[PDB]
Amino acid sequence: DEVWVVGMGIVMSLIVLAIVFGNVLVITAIAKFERLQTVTNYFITSLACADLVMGLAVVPFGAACILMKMWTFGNFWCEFWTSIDVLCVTASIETLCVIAVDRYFAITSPFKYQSLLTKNKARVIILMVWIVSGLTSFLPIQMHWYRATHQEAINCYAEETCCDFFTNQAYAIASSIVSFYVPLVIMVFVYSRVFQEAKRQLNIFEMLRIDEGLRLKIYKDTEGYYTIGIGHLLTKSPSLNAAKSELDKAIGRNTNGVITKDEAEKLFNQDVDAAVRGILRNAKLKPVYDSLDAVRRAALINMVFQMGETGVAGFTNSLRMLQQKRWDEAAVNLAKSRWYNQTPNRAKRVITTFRTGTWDAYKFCLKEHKALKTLGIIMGTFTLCWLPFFIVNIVHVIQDNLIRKEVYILLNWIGYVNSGFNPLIYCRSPDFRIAFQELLCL
Numbered sequence: 001d002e003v004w005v006v007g008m009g010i011v012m013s014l015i016v017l018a019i020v021f022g023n024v025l026v027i028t029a030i031a032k033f034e035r036l037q038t039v040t041n042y043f044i045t046s047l048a049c050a051d052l053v054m055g056l057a058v059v060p061f062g063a064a065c066i067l068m069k070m071w072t073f074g075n076f077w078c079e080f081w082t083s084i085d086v087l088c089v090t091a092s093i094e095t096l097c098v099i100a101v102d103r104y105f106a107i108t109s110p111f112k113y114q115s116l117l118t119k120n121k122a123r124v125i126i127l128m129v130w131i132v133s134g135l136t137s138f139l140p141i142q143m144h145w146y147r148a149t150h151q152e153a154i155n156c157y158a159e160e161t162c163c164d165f166f167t168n169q170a171y172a173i174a175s176s177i178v179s180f181y182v183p184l185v186i187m188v189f190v191y192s193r194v195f196q197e198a199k200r201q202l203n204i205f206e207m208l209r210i211d212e213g214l215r216l217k218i219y220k221d222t223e224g225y226y227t228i229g230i231g232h233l234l235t236k237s238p239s240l241n242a243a244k245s246e247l248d249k250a251i252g253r254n255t256n257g258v259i260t261k262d263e264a265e266k267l268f269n270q271d272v273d274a275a276v277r278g279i280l281r282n283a284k285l286k287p288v289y290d291s292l293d294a295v296r297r298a299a300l301i302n303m304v305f306q307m308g309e310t311g312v313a314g315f316t317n318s319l320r321m322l323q324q325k326r327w328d329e330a331a332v333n334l335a336k337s338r339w340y341n342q343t344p345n346r347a348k349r350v351i352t353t354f355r356t357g358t359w360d361a362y363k364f365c366l367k368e369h370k371a372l373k374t375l376g377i378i379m380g381t382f383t384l385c386w387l388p389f390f391i392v393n394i395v396h397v398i399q400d401n402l403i404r405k406e407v408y409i410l411l412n413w414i415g416y417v418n419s420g421f422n423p424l425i426y427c428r429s430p431d432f433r434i435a436f437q438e439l440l441c442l
Ligand SMILES: *SCCCOc1ccc(CCNC[C@H](O)c2ccc(O)c3[nH]c(=O)ccc23)cc1OC
Pocket: 062, 063, 065, 066, 070, 071, 082, 085, 086, 089, 162, 163, 164, 165, 167, 171, 172, 173, 175, 176, 179, 180, 393, 409, 412
């Protein structure tokens, strides 16, 4: 329609605003707050910068090319605007590829979740990406190599009102493979091993870390006695001074009240051995425990850490079916109890662990695993927004004039919106959520 162009213009203007305002907040939160100045966040700034240049130099000039159906900026800016457009995509895919490699080397490292690259060394990697991007995008466009031999393409380059990206079969293969396909193959494969290592990390300590909760300070439990770390009872005495004398005796140093993650893991290993021996000494728990595998053994220990050996022995109907290796039948009995009524979220994970015999119930539940899931969506969003364009671009090489001009522009425009997608996905992390609130005054 006639007035439809005006209506679509307001929609496209809000997209430009969503990309700029969104990415500005990401770059500002990292630079202003010292809290978010990590090695990975330095690449996030580089990723947000590449998305910012899109919404300032590519997206506003790109939207105007549809509103008037022609170019009103000149042949000089037409070549420059196209050069930035490819540069921003080339840098983004390479930065996301670097993050995938960086996260793999941090997860496999003995000092887990800590990047091997230093602040000064990471800044070089950012510059290495932009220089390689400039050599692969700016050079083939400015120093003409993309120009097609056919007359239909020549008419567009000659015209001052035409800025359609007509490319030869040699460049169309090179620009798709080097600036998109090759970094995508590495990004998908390497980050798949990152999720594989997250599944490898799943242990008895990590299971109770989500269920009970690791607490470095001395706290009074549900009963009233002094507890520390993961369900480790210090003393039954109501005096706090008695707990401090036991805490120093259990570790071997002056604690004063606060301990560490590694020392809490050491105390848990002392408690887990006492729990297993407590089950073996028990007349009812011992025959059931012998008929449980390594993963399912941990689900029974999880119950003992919550209520105790006498409490778990009370589940007469549940234990009889667990010993017989009937998982689906015992799951109903375990759900029909006081344990499920008091702690529903905890029981749901434990019962599902008994059902399958896998740690799949504790997927993306840890503080570290949620951060890996967040970065995984950034890689997933860029793929699902750019791949439908790049997969269609190869069809033009196979069959000439098959895909419509409206189809080519729309699929290219899906990747334009992707620049403003990332800041909204960054809101998932609680560290960034506090940074955006204090900056915008909420
Ligand atoms: S102003 C002309 C009418 C509107 O249509 C457009 C024409 C041209 C563009 C910019 C071209 N898009 C580049 C594309 O995103 C891209 C990126 C990266 C790589 O490696 C590419 N390789 C290719 O072979 C082809 C395209 C590539 C935008 C328009 O829409 C506003």
